[PDB]
Amino acid sequence: YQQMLKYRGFNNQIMQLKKICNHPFVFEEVEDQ
Amino acid sequence: RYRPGTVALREIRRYQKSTELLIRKLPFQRLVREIAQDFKTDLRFQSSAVMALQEASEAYLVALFEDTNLCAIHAKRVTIMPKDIQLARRIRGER
Amino acid sequence: KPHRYRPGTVALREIRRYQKSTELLIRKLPFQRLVREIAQDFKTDLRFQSSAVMALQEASEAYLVALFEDTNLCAIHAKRVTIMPKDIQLARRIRGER
Amino acid sequence: TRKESYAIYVYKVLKQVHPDTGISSKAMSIMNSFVNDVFERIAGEASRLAHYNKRSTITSREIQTAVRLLLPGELAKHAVSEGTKAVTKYTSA
Amino acid sequence: TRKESYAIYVYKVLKQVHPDTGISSKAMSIMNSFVNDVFERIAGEASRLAHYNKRSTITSREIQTAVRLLLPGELAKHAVSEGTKAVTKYTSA
Amino acid sequence: DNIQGITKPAIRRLARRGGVKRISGLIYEETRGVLKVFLENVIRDAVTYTEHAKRKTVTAMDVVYALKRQGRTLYGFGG
Amino acid sequence: KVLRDNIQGITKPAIRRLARRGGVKRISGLIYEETRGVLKVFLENVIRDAVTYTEHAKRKTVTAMDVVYALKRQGRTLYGFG
Amino acid sequence: AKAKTRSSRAGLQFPVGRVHRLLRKGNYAERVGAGAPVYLAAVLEYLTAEILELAGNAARDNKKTRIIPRHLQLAVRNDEELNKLLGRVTIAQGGVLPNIQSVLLPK
Amino acid sequence: AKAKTRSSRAGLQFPVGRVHRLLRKGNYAERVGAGAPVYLAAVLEYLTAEILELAGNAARDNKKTRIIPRHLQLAVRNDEELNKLLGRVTIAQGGVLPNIQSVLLPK
DNA sequence: CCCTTGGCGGTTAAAACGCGGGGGACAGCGCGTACGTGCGTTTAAGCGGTGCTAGAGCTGTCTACGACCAATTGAGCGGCCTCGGCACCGGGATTCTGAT
DNA sequence: ATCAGAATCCCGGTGCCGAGGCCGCTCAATTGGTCGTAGACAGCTCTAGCACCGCTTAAACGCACGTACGCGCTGTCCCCCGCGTTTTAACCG
């Protein structure tokens, strides 16, 4: 929330939080790491 | 069945006849965006800009295949090879 | 028997020799008379400075050297060590000069 | 905001050459970019010729020499003919 | 008639890089034509950038972008670094 | 990924337009490499003109000035 | 005074030397005349540009600067002569 | 007196005044002569008239009364001199002249 | 007060004043900023310093303490970036880099 | 006024002309494998439609900044002198090519 | 795998004409002041650009199969190279 909201690449601020509260695994690199 | 090489010629006349764009929009646009990510992040593209890169790219590749065809035919072969491409790009001074 | 070099060795030694130095490979007076003849067809009774003729000699010789480099690339691409006119006009066709 | 173009002029010349033939908007854009291109070429060559000869004024002579440099052969000959005729009729009347 | 050149400046820079090495007159002429060439290139690109963006003043930003256009890669990076340092020290003191 | 999104039939068609009759199997990777090169060369310039104007949008005029910048002039999109 | 056959003044050993510098190992006998034609075309171009510059300046002498502006005009920049 | 356009004096359809303005504000030279916009506008009129003439001929040959970029591609590349002038140009939606090397044709 | 040269302020050996004059009278733009001659002169100093550095290294490799056009030809063409910048340039008295295609060598 | 053109005479490196012969251009032939061609199966492209909002685009002040002119002077340049790094040469040692 | 021998590198010596420093002599670079104005900054509008999904279908993909041609090999012959001799036009003054 604070780190990825601090990234501010684009349109994510709305897209980032809906996903991470639902799934972390929707992101490919995150699920890979 | 047609003898091999006839369908290729009919395609030559067909595509040389029309103005149609030979590369699909969305893949080329995603490619342009990927290549542009390495320069400045979070960029906006107008549709006419992507269309411009598609025009210049397709025309450049068409000319490159013309000169490559000239090289292959100069080698007494009807099949273009990578050494023909890189030869043409070596003679043009692009490398 | 008189000692003779195998064909192609003298050519390579000449390659190293001329690629080693800066010497101009075309004689002055013939090239100057050629420039004057070509210039007669444009405007009659023209004066040329020596540095101008030297300039045309520099540009001409360098242009022909590059042309023979690309022509050599074509001939070698054809799996032949002997350049041919079709190699020249091929290079000038790919460069867009014709 | 008013963005001017050469569209109506290419249209007039087209109606002079081929009164019965129309032109698409895209082809009109190509003609516009063509006129702007050639214009910038002749103007640039005129600037170079004016700078090398150390003169601060572009006259019809520099434009003439620039046309003779840019346009190969018959385009240069007929172009210089039409232009010289246009300046002739211009200053005569 | 006094025809100025960059000769003495290329000479000074040469004595900075290689104090023990001299330069022939012909090589000095080549360096002169090189400096004039690159100068006309950067100035021309600066004029184009100033005209396309509709500004009548050439500043350090247009020269910077022109350097980034003309010089490939590391020449552009180190060139912009040295120039930015020079303007920095210039306006600072 | 993306550059693979340029398809064997696509490059095949681009070669059919150029006059090529028969194509070797290795032309495709080289063509993708060349395309990536050219696109990097044009896009770095277009992004340069974009950053100079202090804009976040890459317009058509930027690409036209990049192509004219590299010596290949384009018409119909403005200039 | 009409000048003719001066392009033949370019000698077979000359062009041979140019090819030896260009990296050519063996030369075919038909290269020569073609090379003379190409050189003549190039000189026609550069000389028509330079003579055009000289005509514009109302001068009877072709300066090296005119040749440099003709070469740079064609896209080949020549350093060292001005 | 009633103002008469300078384009109508020389008999030119192109805006001599606009060309004059572009020469003044184009940062070309410090001063601009009185014959430069007329002569230049005339040259542009000749070139445009020629390319539109060939384009119209190609359009008439293709049985289309509206000129399209394809007709400009054909009209230019089929002409030698305009091809020499525009050789470095890429025309959008132009296409390629139909061509096949004679060795590639069956026999 | 005693006049101090602007070239000495920024620490540049090149004539910032002369570059400023050439930008003013060069018909580039109508107005010239105060940072353009300094920045441009610095860029020219970097380029000249590099090409003279490579030229000096080549001269030292050839056992000659005086730089000749051959050393400029070698110093440029041996470097990749300067070759990309000067690729269209013909240097007088330059010569050609020694090169032989590996297929032409005997075996 | 100085740099181009023209002429003349003596030297000699270079070009023309010829002549063997060996190696490479070129035609033919055969093999194997790689690419064209068609068909069934997926699959994202194309088109549409929704929801949001970031930044393009224009305006209105307002001010630092560059053009412009007068005064002044020192950095750079043309003319003018040294002197030494490099062209040129002559001899010797070394290396690379070719027939045993 | 090796000597004969022709070409090349190396070294010592010599002569010279261009590189390098000096010295008047400017005239353009620097300073000091003004004066108008381009653009820097803040504000406002609203358009096109961004993401996403629904839904259809033309195109791509995988595969089976045939045969056209690339490439390796061989033989032939012809033509361009290496060298000697003779002439001439470049070159230099």
CATH topology of domain H1-107: Histone, subunit A (1.10.20)
CA of E58 to C1' of J45 (A): 47
Distance CA H43, CA H71 (A): 22
Q: What structural domains and CATH numbers belong to chain D?
A: 1-93 (1.10.20.10)
* Distance of G47 CA from K13 C1′ (whole Å): 48
Q: For each of the domains in chain F, give its residue range(s) and CATH number, in order of start.
A: 1-77 (1.10.20.10)
Nearest nucleotide, C1' to the C-alpha of B33? K50
Chain D residues with CB-CB distance to G52 below 8 A: 65, 68-69
Residue I6 and residue E90: Cβ atoms within 8 Å? yes
* Subunits in contact with chain A (3 or more CB pairs closer than 8 Å): B
Rounded-to-integer distance, Cα D70 and Cα D37, Å: 12
Considering CB atoms only, which of G21, G75, G79 is closest to I92?
G79
Residue B7 sits at the chain F interface (C-beta within 8 Å):
no
* Strand runs labelled E in H1-107: 31-32, 66-67, 89-91
Three-class DSSP category at G26 = strand
Query: Within an 8 Å CB–CB cutoff, is residue B58 touching chain C?
Result: no
As beta bridge partners, residue D55 has none
Distance between CA atoms of C9 and D39, rounded to whole angstroms? Answer: 57
Short-list D14, B10, F63, CA closest to H75: D14
> Hey, are the CB atoms on G80 and I96 less than 8 Å from each other?
no
Q: Identify whether the C-beta of residue C84 lies closer than 8 Å to the C-beta of residue G31.
A: yes
Chains I and C touch (3+ CB pairs under 8 A): yes
Give the closest-approach CA distance of C65 to chain I in angstroms: 9
Q: Is residue H39 within 8 Å of residue H58, measured between CB atoms?
A: no
User: What whole-number distance in Å separates Cα of residue D17 and Cα of residue H52?
Assistant: 8
C-alpha distances in Å from residue B22, one per residue of C50, F5, F36, H95: 55, 13, 17, 11
Is any Cβ of chain H less than 8 angstroms from the Cβ of E47? yes
Domain boundaries, chain I: 1-107
Measured in residues, chain A has a length of 33
Q: Within 33-52 of chain I, which residues have Cβ less than 7 Å from strand J?
A: 33-35
In whole angstroms, give the CA distance from residue D91 to residue G7: 47
Cβ E12 to strand K below 7 Å: no
Assign residue B54 the CATH number of its domain: 1.10.20.10
Closest CA to G68 of G55, G60, G79: G79
Contact yes or no for I36/E75 (Cβ under 8 A): no
Host H or E run for residue C17? helix C9-20
CB contact at 8 A, G9 and C30: yes
CA atoms within 13 A on the CB side of B65: 30
**What residues of E are in contact with residue H27 (Cβ under 8 Å)?**
47, 51
Residue G79: strand, helix, or coil:
strand
Resolution value in angstroms: 9.0
Chain D closest CA to I4's CA: distance in Å?
32
Residues D22, D24, D25, D29, Cα dihedral to 10°: -90
Residue D35: which of H30, B86, H46, H60 has the closest Cα?
H46
Q: Which residues contact residue E20 at a Cβ distance below 8 angstroms, ignoring those fewer than 6 apart?
A: I65
Give the distance, in angstroms, between residue C4 CA and nucleotide K83 C1': 8
Question: What technique was this entry resolved by?
Answer: cryo-EM
